[PDB]
Amino acid sequence: TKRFDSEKAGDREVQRTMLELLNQLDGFQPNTQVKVIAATNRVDILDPALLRSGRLDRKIEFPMPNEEARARIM
């Protein structure tokens, strides 16, 4: 996660690695044809640069289930 003003620690190997995904991810270096299946329980901790539509185009929800959905699993 980028948000650093860290002069006290905070590694910044980790800073490079999130930034690098964007780099690969811009159109200049192809990524049109390859899909990335991204998964997170918390999108409540991420930033918009990594997420946000048209960088990872489709955004698929899975809301809580209901009785029929319970019915088929059982």
């Binding site: 049109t32 899909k35 299946i37 489709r58 698929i60 929800e61 899975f62 289930p65 029929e68 959905a69 319970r70 019915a71 088929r72 699993i73 059982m74």
Partner: protein
């Protein structure tokens, strides 16, 4: 070209051989392992969602011609 591996002899620096460009050991782990089927019917409920994932992920790769016909990226 730049990025290519090439061998060179230690005892006197001549090019031993030419090798093609290749990934780290960690990356080899990252490559395919494959996962087995839960089958669409068999993975219980969430019906509207089976459609959303199938359409997005697997179809543009496998059922590619229909997408080319749509004209989308």
């Amino acid at each position: 070209k730049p990025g290519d591996l090439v061998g060179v002899n230690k005892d006197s620096y001549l090019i031993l051989e030419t090798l093609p460009t290749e990934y780290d050991s960690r990356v080899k782990a990252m490559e395919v392992d494959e996962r087995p089927t839960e089958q669409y019917s068999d993975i219980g409920g969430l019906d509207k969602q089976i459609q959303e994932l199938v359409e997005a992920i697997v179809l543009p790769m496998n059922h590619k011609e229909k997408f080319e016909n749509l004209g989308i990226q």
